[PDB]
Amino acid sequence: SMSYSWTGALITPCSPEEEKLPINPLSNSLLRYHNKVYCTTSKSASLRAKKVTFDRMQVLDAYYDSVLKDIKLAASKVSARLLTLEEACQLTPPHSARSKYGFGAKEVRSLSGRAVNHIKSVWKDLLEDSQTPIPTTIMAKNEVFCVDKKAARLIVYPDLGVRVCEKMALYDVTQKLPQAVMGASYGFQYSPAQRVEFLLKAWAEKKDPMGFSYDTRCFDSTVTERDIRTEESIYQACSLPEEARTAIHSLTERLYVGGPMFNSKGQSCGYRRCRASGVLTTSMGNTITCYVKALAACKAAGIVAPTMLVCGDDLVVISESQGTEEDERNLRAFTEAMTRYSAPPGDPPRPEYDLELITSCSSNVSVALGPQGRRRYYLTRDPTTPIARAAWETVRHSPVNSWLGNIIQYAPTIWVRMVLMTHFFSILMAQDTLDQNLNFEMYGSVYSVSPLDLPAIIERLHGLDAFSLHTYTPHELTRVASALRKLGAPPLRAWKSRARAVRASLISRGGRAAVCGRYLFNWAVKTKLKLTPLPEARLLDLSSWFTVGAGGGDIYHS
């Protein structure tokens, strides 16, 4: 019942790691307190290992049984197909960890003979062997944060050849199952604006709304072998081809329920009996399992008219308040139920009665005014981590960055518009690489776009309002100002001074650059420009852009 067992071998790096932000003028113009920005490395891997290693005691009840029964029935409405090898390969990100069998992501995406022939044998083996555990590699993730340090997160994943096979057997399922059994509660199907709409709607439909977010301590580690086998039974409730059923059972028994882990040096590192952090089913599995336990927990605790929003292990519940004292009582009961289901809390949940203060996936809804003086709602978050990461990525190029993802996801926020856009467009112009497509992650998934196409992307995802919001809330302004001073970054008024110059340079360039200048920086001048709908905004193939990401899991798009 232990999440992990260890041999004693260390979790090793695949190359030297840098832990402190370098002193560079480009990064320094964004933030001066470089000593506050750090990156997690292999050095803290042992501390993390101890944190995620514990015994899981799970006891289910009638409430859980009832919800699961309902879920399986809903799953029967799903029909899915096996993805072709070619389709599976095209979903592989270009910088995906290479195989130990002689090929990398490049050969996969290009369908090289070597890659194709190996993948084929892996598939055949899955069909004839449903027992032999599949080996995985454990590594310490390198992530950037601002002090006030975190231990590195651990990632466990199978060989490239197996990752392609997972797509063939389950990608189609990840695209339909969550919605089928969860409906509107499935978070990954929404763009930021849709998430906002959902939360506002849920809040408004309650006579006396109360919300709370539940933080499960090390969710992946709380997932039991039984939980994972239950996930498979839910997958099998779908209408699937026999060959897929065989592959899915094999992957479950040989990979998902657990298996041996090796470090980068090839040494046996340990054995896993919980969720693998780096498999295709990580997000979908966490989402469904979190949903089942939470819905059952709500019923057992007496939560009234709960409306849930589930994103992997992230959970937010908005319901009818039963009074302050009752609410706190019900939340404790909820926690007790979640705990019995093997999902104890990291930080005890507390009832919240102001929507702007409720955090879902580190984000929250806030309000501002549009060009006509009307209230407009949008999604935002504390900008500390995004700015710290933007600084690191300015001096250390990452094949898959996070800043472009933050700019897209939080385009209407005051921090993206005044700080990130100003900073990156200045650097891109200086580098003269404005039109170059860049890979970035969003919702744990990998995407690729050109910053020159940002205005079209933003208008399509957030609307023209995204270029004209003003009069943000005191909470938002205070939070952004505090983040900047904490990082030693220039204040917003200085970013405004800089933006005027960036805007002018962009416009001087004409073409798409000028469009970026006129639309993205209209806020920087007192004499505002018109700003009409962009034609290319309609020619955009966005709609399920987030659904196709199905959370994360080594998935790539365009």
From Swiss-Prot:
Name used for this protein in its record: RNA-directed RNA polymerase
Where are the coiled-coil regions?
Answer: none
Q: Where in the cell is it found?
A: Host cytoplasm; Host endoplasmic reticulum membrane
Where does the source fall among the domains of life?
Viruses
The positions making up the signal sequence are none
The way this protein sits in the membrane is described as: Single-pass type IV membrane protein
UniProt domain RdRp catalytic: residue ranges? 209-327
What reaction does this catalyse? RNA(n) + a ribonucleoside 5'-triphosphate = RNA(n+1) + diphosphate
List ligand-binding residues for Mg(2+) 2: 215, 313-314
Q: Which cofactor does it need?
A: Mg(2+)
Question: What is this protein's function per UniProt?
Answer: RNA-dependent RNA polymerase that performs primer-template recognition and RNA synthesis during viral replication. Initiates RNA transcription/replication at a flavin adenine dinucleotide (FAD), resulting in a 5'- FAD cap on viral RNAs. In this way, recognition of viral 5' RNA by host pattern recognition receptors can be bypassed, thereby evading activation of antiviral pathways.
Entry note: cofactor: Binds 2 magnesium ion that constitute a dinuclear catalytic metal center.
What about PTM? The N-terminus is phosphorylated by host PRK2/PKN2.
Regulation affecting activity: Activity is up-regulated by PRK2/PKN2-mediated phosphorylation.
Q: Which organism is it from?
A: Hepatitis C virus genotype 2a (isolate HC-J6)
Question: What assembly does the database describe for this protein?
Answer: Homooligomer. Interacts with non-structural protein 5A. Interacts with host VAPB. Interacts with host PRK2/PKN2. Interacts with host HNRNPA1 and SEPT6; these interactions facilitate viral replication. Part of the replication complex composed of NS2, NS3, NS4A, NS4B, NS5A and the RNA-directed RNA polymerase.
